[PDB]
Design a protein around this ligand. Structure first.
Ligand SMILES: CCCCCCCCCCCCCCCCCC(=O)OC[C@H](COP(=O)([O-])OCC(O)COP(=O)([O-])OC[C@@H](COC(=O)CCCCCCCCCCCCCCCCC)OC(=O)CCCCCCCCCCCCCCCCC)OC(=O)CCCCCCCCCCCCCCCCC
Ligand SMILES: CCCCCCCCCCCCCCCCCC(=O)OC[C@H](COP(=O)([O-])OCC[N+](C)(C)C)OC(=O)CCCCCCCCCCCCCCCCC
Ligand SMILES: CCCCCCCCCCCCCCCCCC(=O)OC[C@H](COP(=O)([O-])OCC[N+](C)(C)C)OC(=O)CCCCCCCCCCCCCCCCC
Ligand SMILES: CCCCCCCCCCCCCCCC(=O)OC[C@H](COP(=O)(O)O)OC(=O)CCCCCCCCCCCCCCC
Lengths: 505, 136, 177, 125, 53, 134, 148, 67
């Protein structure tokens, strides 16, 4: 019963949501530039900053709704396309349906849009995490950094082109564009003075991996003059070229997606970055690397043993889990948790295009939401209690019961209770790893889910419980409606996404 | 495709699958990679001839698809390694039926090349199964 | 146009078909393509791009279909456990059901493993099995809403075809022996 | 280019060869030329027009609903909002309650319509 | 909608194959019944011919 | 019996004029050689244009409803609740009375296309239809 | 699908019946449990009405009412879940899905099979009528021969 | 639009993806191929003429070019 109307509606929605975002950004930027001689806030109720905040927030939100609709259309379209290809067995019949483009808006960068489930999951993560982070950064943007209210819109446009393109070069360029806005945010919006050095560490560490990926892309392009991302089927790389490409790709994308030993920059940046931008970084900016690694390694044929890469990922997991205990800083502890989860996700991609990719994608989504939740809780603690250190913070539950309850439920979700996409992703990865290498699976599970979990829980429980006798004149009140509903939405997603259609998982 | 009908079947249509020999698979893959130019040429020339003389009143309407004959013969020779004749008309009786099916797919039904390559490859596979050691 | 990467090995290549001798370090782009890079990277390289996409989808569906067999037999075992008391339960299970449970073990069905390690012959056999099931279904046209899409005219023509086929099958006499 | 009708004579080729390389029916030739063997370009154009109209309706409805909800329920604290709504007239209260819901619901319904293919002619039996 | 429309193709194939096998069994039963009726008619025709002779 | 009744019903439908556009669309879908390609394409265009359902009708209905509520609220002082409710109910009921009829036979393009073929009393059209009934 | 347990004889079944055993048979859902039942929908309507009244009373007396709201909202949701569960072709421990139920998702095969069954029934009826005519002719011949 | 109207591929892809390839191949590939096939065209013409005549030349048989 599938008809061409659904196909064209899917394509039109995907194409036009990008232009909706772009036109919103363009209008907002034109207003901002041409309303004032100097593009800084006027400290009065009639400033354009209020309009810009409104436009950014409710462009992201409306584009997120349209993205939900377009993602559902894509799911139907992909399912029915697979059915059309698979169903017919007659040799004379073949599915050759050709679509003509609309005459209203042009194709951005003269590229035909191609959408995949992983790309749309990444785009949904971008939308939601960007919404949370923009909601967080309101107190940070003041009177000279208001120009960074558009950072998340720029991120959304970059990610949209990144996930809706079938061109290798455009793919790589979109991946590399993410550096400038993130560096500028960390440099100009971070309150702490150590953020200045943290930004440089972030730039250099990420750029080393960017150069590695650039070398790999140069190898692919120079050898294969193609750029369509599908002509690689008709060209085979020799053993030496293939091993060089996989090594470069893995190391370069692991610089971004933190792997052992390349997580020093991540720890520094998470500790010294804005509490609202740490959410976006951990939640989304480390998963574009995973998506790019998946695309490249599934496109290239590799005839090498992945034991070395699996060992690197497992070593990162073990290192982060063991170090969890020794952190009294909640933000650094959450950063180590992010490193652990990202290393597990990266390990999920070490078997080419096997079924491990499904667990990897689900784990990427759950880690995004869980890291957003954890960093937002740390943000609330730091903002109301003027410290994010375990020695200075104690007995949160008895003065701010809602915040303590949020911490406890965050710990329960992090533990991986059944009924959560966290548990589902752990089940996928461990079920595969048990047959792949059962002893390695046992070691990984033991370390991560006992030693790292206990180290993680020690600090959070100590902060939540106790007796806050110190500085009774300065104790805060409670979570606000904004914070409470953000926490509730994170919990709601982590719980209900387990009912998403199992066809794609 | 790669399915054999059941000779003694209780119901009208029953099929049992078979897997071609590795030698046959290698031969077909190599020949397709080497001769893929001819198949794209057949598609482009088919469209070109239809555009040129598709109209009934056209002068060359009575010579339809004859220019494609050279491309088809070249593709057949390339796939069969110049053996078993220099023309599609010289196809052995073992592959004659599949050759007729391919011609019906391409020129009469004007079906997609995705469909008609199946019948052309079936012709090549029939020849290869018949001979075996002659092609390799 | 495709290109190549300069080679460093000092080996000699003897092409008996073309009756020439080359050196690995001296190969140009086309010679590299012809001699190196000519290996296969898929189960059925003989098939076209569209045909191999169909083959890949059928292989994925066939793996899911074998997993479905395992799930169905497990559900039947649960049904047997609930319906039949523990006495005679194993006696009745030591039949077709137990043999099928063992025959649907991990080597034959990929329950939760990342990859079902199948040779190209095994993949071809699985795809052939899926195609046999598809042929049996399409004989009677059971795939219109599920596992297929068709227009109204196609549905009407298929209904008439299935009606004729059923009439002929009914009119056929019983199979002897 | 040597691939042309020039120099070709039906005398040279056999009758079976001519029958094999004979043009199909005029209708078949027209369908192949226009690429309308399965679907017509006009059907594609109609589908595209409906898709664009549906997207515009959905996006406009979502924007209207979101903005109306925000501006109506973003006037102040709970007490202030309750007092403002109490002083609000009957028709003004009705619109404030109904506008956002109707816009969002219409957008969602238009989205559901596309995936739900009810207008299929095979409904029978 | 998820449950009704987006269903596992493997399980759909299994259900349709079960339905096809059941249809084939019913066709076998119909063949047996038709054969029985035809044999009865042939027996009656033979009896009528013998009586006429 | 059953097949004869089915064929007789098909003949009766062919005789009836209100179903001729649908039956000619069935012929068009079958792609029978009798129907010329140009006429087939024209009929497909007109039939698709006539049958397509657009969200514009729903959008304008909701727009009229919202505009009525907004206008009564803003441009009327101390409006009567009973009058407002009656007007709203009347508008909602009137929305239901708008029931366009797809009189495709009345539509002069489709009728002009298929009148020349006159599927009724046409043996080729009957043969085409008999295999395709739904 | 095929029978898994070893077969038993009809004589053995009759022996068990005489002994007094009964054949296990799944029972239809009662009207209260059946989601397609007038009793079920009357219960839903009563739930909705009582929930609205109790919600109004709770608002009056300053008592929580989100639970009555949940009842009202979940009545349609419970109906959706129950109807979907019933419609799905999933065979838990219970009655097996029949050919008609499976064909309800195969409209083409369903209609074709119905037509084929009707034609086969007509064919069998025609053969039976011809058999009766042949028997009548044989009887008439016998009577005529005996009288002659 | 205008800046890219020279080539169907986007400008960034043109700048980076194409490394070392002739601009004759990037733009106007048909003329590039025909120039490359110049002599093969006359060989094919001679083969066709001989085929019309009694002679059949097997050496140049593979040369059946359409672009
Ligand atoms: C466009 C793409 C997306 C883009 C992005 C969009 C992003 C937007 C943001 C949001 C994200 C959206 C993502 C997509 C969502 C898709 C959703 C969807 O498709 O919906 C349709 C989807 C399926 O649609 P369908 O298949 O088409 O429907 C037709 C089918 O035929 C229907 O038939 P069916 O059989 O399939 O029905 C399914 C369902 C039908 O629903 C029901 O039947 C309702 C059953 C309710 C049972 C409630 C009680 C259960 C527990 C008690 C049981 C024991 C009782 C005592 C027994 C005593 C015995 C002696 O039934 C069940 O699943 C049964 C599960 C029962 C257990 C549920 C809870 C388990 C525990 C979970 C814990 C997790 C949190 C831990 C927290 C720990 C502390 C921090 O349906 C649902 O969504 C079902 C939701 C069910 C919710 C159940 C209520 C949860 C209760 C939690 C209690 C926890 C208590 C505290 C724990 C301990 C704390 C210490
Ligand atoms: C060649 C064509 C070029 C087109 C350029 C477009 C020009 C855009 C100019 C924007 C001016 C914004 C200020 C208008 C005056 C607001 C007055 C006011 O506050 O009174 C309340 C009145 C009415 O309030 P209300 O109380 O009736 O609330 C209901 C609101 N509506 C009507 C929208 C349902 O005005 C508004 O509320 C309008 C708010 C406008 C700002 C919206 C911000 C969200 C993001 C969209 C911004 C525009 C970008 C383009 C659209 C998105 C991308 C497709
Ligand atoms: C981890 C180090 C610290 C972090 C920085 C990361 C730097 C290193 C990044 C990975 C580079 C690749 C290493 C693995 C190579 C595997 C293949 C191989 O060489 O085996 C012999 C290969 C494979 O041979 P084979 O035996 O498998 O098959 C071919 C055999 N013959 C040729 C005989 C037929 O042999 C070769 O062809 C030699 C290739 C050597 C290439 C080495 C230089 C690579 C230069 C590009 C990357 C430079 C990145 C620098 C980044 C900045 C550093 C500060
Ligand atoms: C917020 C409403 C959203 C409506 C949904 C569609 C949005 C499409 C993107 C619009 C972006 C802003 C305008 C850009 C103008 C421009 O420079 O646009 C310039 C381009 C022109 O392109 P060309 O020069 O190539 O022709 O505009 C377009 O291509 C089409 C613009 C959109 C056409 C639909 C307009 C719908 C109007 C709805 C009115 C009611 C809205 C109520 C909101 C509360």
């Amino acid at each position: 019963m599938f008809n061409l109307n659904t196909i064209y509606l899917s394509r039109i929605f995907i194409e036009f949501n990008f232009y909706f975002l772009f036109f919103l950004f363009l209008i907002s930027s034109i207003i901002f530039y041409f309303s004032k001689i100097i593009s800084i806030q006027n400290l009065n109720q009639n400033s354009v900053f209020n309009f810009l905040k409104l436009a950014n927030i409710f462009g992201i939100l409306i584009s997120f709704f349209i993205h939900i609709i377009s993602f559902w259309f894509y799911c139907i379209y992909s399912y029915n396309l697979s059915l059309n290809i698979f169903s017919d067995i007659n040799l004379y019949n073949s599915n050759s349906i050709e679509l003509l483009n609309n005459s209203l808006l042009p194709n951005y960068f003269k590229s035909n849009i191609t959408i995949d489930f992983f790309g749309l999951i990444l785009l949904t993560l971008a939308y939601i995490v960007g919404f949370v982070s923009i909601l967080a950064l309101d107190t940070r943007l003041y009177w000279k950094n208001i120009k960074y209210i558009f950072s998340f819109t720029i991120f959304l446009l970059i990610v949209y082109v990144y996930v809706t393109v079938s061109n290798i070069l455009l793919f790589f360029m979109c991946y590399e564009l993410l550096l400038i806005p993130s560096f500028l945010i960390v440099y100009f919006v971070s309150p702490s003075r150590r953020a200045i050095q943290a930004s440089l560490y972030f730039v250099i560490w990420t750029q080393l991996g960017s150069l590695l990926v650039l070398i790999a892309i140069s190898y692919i392009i120079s050898i294969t003059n193609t750029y369509e991302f599908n002509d690689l089927k008709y060209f085979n790389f020799t053993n030496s070229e293939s091993t060089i490409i996989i090594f470069l790709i893995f190391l370069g994308f692991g610089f971004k997606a933190p792997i052992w030993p390349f997580h020093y920059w991540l720890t520094k940046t998470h500790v010294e970055a804005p509490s609202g931008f740490s959410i976006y970084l951990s939640g989304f900016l480390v998963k574009t690397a995973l998506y790019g690694f998946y695309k490249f390694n599934t496109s290239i044929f590799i005839d090498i043993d992945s034991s070395i890469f699996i060992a690197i990922c497992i070593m990162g997991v073990v290192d982060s889990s063991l170090k969890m205990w020794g952190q009294t800083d909640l933000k650094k502890l959450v950063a180590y948790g992010t490193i652990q989860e990202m290393n597990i996700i990266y390990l999920a991609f070490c078997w080419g295009d096997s079924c491990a990719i499904l667990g990897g994608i689900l784990f990427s989504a759950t880690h995004a939401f869980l890291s957003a939740l954890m960093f937002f809780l740390v943000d609330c603690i730091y903002r109301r209690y003027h410290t994010r250190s375990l020695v200075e913070v104690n007995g949160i539950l008895h003065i701010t019961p809602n915040l303590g309850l949020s911490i406890l439920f965050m710990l329960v979700f992090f533990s991986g209770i059944p009924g959560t996409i966290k548990f589902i992703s752990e089940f996928y990865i461990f079920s595969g790893l048990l047959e792949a290498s059962p002893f390695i699976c046992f070691i990984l599970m033991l370390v991560a889910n006992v030693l790292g979990l206990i180290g993680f829980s020690k600090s959070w429980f100590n902060a939540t419980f106790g007796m806050p006798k110190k500085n009774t004149k300065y104790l805060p009140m409670d979570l606000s409606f904004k914070e409470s509903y953000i926490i509730l939405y994170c919990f709601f997603f982590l719980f209900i996404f387990s009912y998403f259609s199992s066809i794609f998982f | 495709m790669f399915l054999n009908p059941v000779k003694d079947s209780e119901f009208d249509d029953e099929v049992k699958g078979f897997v071609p020999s590795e030698g046959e698979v290698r031969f077909v893959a190599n020949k397709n990679k080497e001769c893929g130019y001819y198949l794209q040429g057949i598609e482009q020339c088919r469209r070109k001839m239809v555009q040129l003389a598709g109209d009934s009143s056209s002068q060359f309407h009575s010579l339809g698809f004859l220019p494609c004959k050279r491309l088809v013969d070249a593709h057949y020779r390339c796939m069969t390694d110049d053996k078993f004749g220099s023309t599609i008309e010289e196809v052995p009786e073992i592959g004659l039926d599949s050759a007729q099916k391919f011609f019906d797919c391409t020129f009469q039904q004007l079906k997609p090349m995705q469909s008609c390559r199946r019948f052309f490859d079936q012709v090549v596979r029939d020849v290869y199964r018949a001979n075996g050691s002659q092609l390799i | 146009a495709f290109g190549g990467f300069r080679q460093t090995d000092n080996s000699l290549i003897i092409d008996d078909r073309r009756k020439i001798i080359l050196n690995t370090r001296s190969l140009n782009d086309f010679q590299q393509k012809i001699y190196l890079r000519n290996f296969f990277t898929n189960y059925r390289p003989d098939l076209s791009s569209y045909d191999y996409f169909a083959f890949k989808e059928k292989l994925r569906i066939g793996e899911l279909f074998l997993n479905e067999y395992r799930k169905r037999i497990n559900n039947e075992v649960r049904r047997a456990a609930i319906l039949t008391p523990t006495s005679s339960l194993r006696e009745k299970m030591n039949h077709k059901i137990a043999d099928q449970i063992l025959d649907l073990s991990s080597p034959h069905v990929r329950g939760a493993h990342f990859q079902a390690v199948r040779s190209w012959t095994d993949a071809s056999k699985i795809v052939n099995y899926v195609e046999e099931k598809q042929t049996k279904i399409n004989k009677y046209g059971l795939q219109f809403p599920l596992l297929g899409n068709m227009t109204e005219e196609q549905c009407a023509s298929k209904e008439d075809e299935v009606y004729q086929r059923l009439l002929k099958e009914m009119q056929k006499p019983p199979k002897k022996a | 280019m040597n691939i042309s009708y020039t120099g070709l004579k039906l005398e040279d080729y056999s009758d079976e060869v001519i029958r094999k390389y004979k043009f199909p029916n005029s209708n078949e030739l027209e369908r192949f030329l226009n690429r309308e063997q399965t679907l017509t370009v006009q059907q594609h154009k109609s589908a595209i027009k409906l898709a664009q109209q549906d997207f515009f309706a959905v996006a406009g409805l979502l924007s209207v609903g979101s903005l109306s909800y925000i501006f109506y329920n973003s006037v102040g604290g709970k007490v202030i909002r309750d007092r403002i709504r109490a002083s609000r007239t009957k028709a003004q209260k009705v619109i404030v309650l109904a506008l956002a819901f109707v816009a969002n619901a219409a957008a969602l319904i238009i989205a559901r319509n596309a995936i739900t293919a009810h207008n299929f002619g095979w409904q029978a039996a | 909608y998820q449950g009704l429309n987006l269903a596992n193709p493997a399980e759909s194939l299994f259900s349709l194959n079960t339905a096809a096998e059941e249809i084939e069994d019913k066709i076998r039963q119909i063949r047996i019944d038709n054969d029985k009726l035809l044999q009865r008619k042939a027996q009656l025709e033979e009896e009528l011919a013998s009586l006429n002779n | 019996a059953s097949q004869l009744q089915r064929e007789q019903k098909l003949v009766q439908s062919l005789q009836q004029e209100s179903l001729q556009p649908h039956l000619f669309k069935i012929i068009v879908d079958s792609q029978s050689d009798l129907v010329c390609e140009a006429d087939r394409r024209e009929y497909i265009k007109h039939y698709t244009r006539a049958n397509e359902k657009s969200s514009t009708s729903q959008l304008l209905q909701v727009g009229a409803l919202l505009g009525y509520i907004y206008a009564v609220g803003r441009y009327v002082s101390n409006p009567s609740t009973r009058k407002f409710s009656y007007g709203l109910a009347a508008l909602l009921g009137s929305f239901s009375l708008l029931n366009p009829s797809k009189n495709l036979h009345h539509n002069h393009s489709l009728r002009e296309i298929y009148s020349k073929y006159n599927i009724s009393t046409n043996p080729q059209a009957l043969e085409i239809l008999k295999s395709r009934i739904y | 699908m095929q029978n898994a347990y070893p077969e038993i004889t009809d004589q053995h079944r009759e022996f068990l019946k005489k002994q007094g055993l009964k054949v296990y048979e799944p029972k239809p859902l009662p009207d209260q449990i059946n989601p397609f039942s007038k009793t079920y929908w009357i219960t839903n309507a009563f739930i909705i009405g009582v929930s609205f009244l109790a919600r109004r009373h709770a608002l009056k007396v300053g008592a929580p009412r989100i639970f009555w709201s949940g009842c009202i909202v979940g009545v349609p949701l419970a109906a959706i879940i129950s109807r979907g569960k019933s419609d799905q072709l999933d065979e838990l421990v219970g009655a097996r899905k029949t050919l008609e139920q499976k064909l309800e998702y195969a409209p083409i095969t369903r209609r074709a099979w119905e037509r084929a069954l009707a034609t086969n029934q007509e064919y069998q009826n025609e053969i039976k009528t011809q058999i009766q005519d042949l028997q009548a002719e044989i009887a008439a011949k016998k009577v005529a021969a005996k009288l002659e | 639009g205008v800046w890219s109207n020279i080539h169907p591929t986007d400008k960034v892809t043109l700048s980076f993806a194409n490394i070392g390839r002739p601009f004759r191949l990037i733009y106007r590939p048909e003329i590039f191929l025909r120039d490359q096939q110049a002599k093969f065209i006359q060989l094919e013409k001679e083969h066709i003429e001989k085929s019309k005549k009694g002679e059949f030349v097997e050496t140049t048989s593979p040369l059946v070019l359409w672009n």
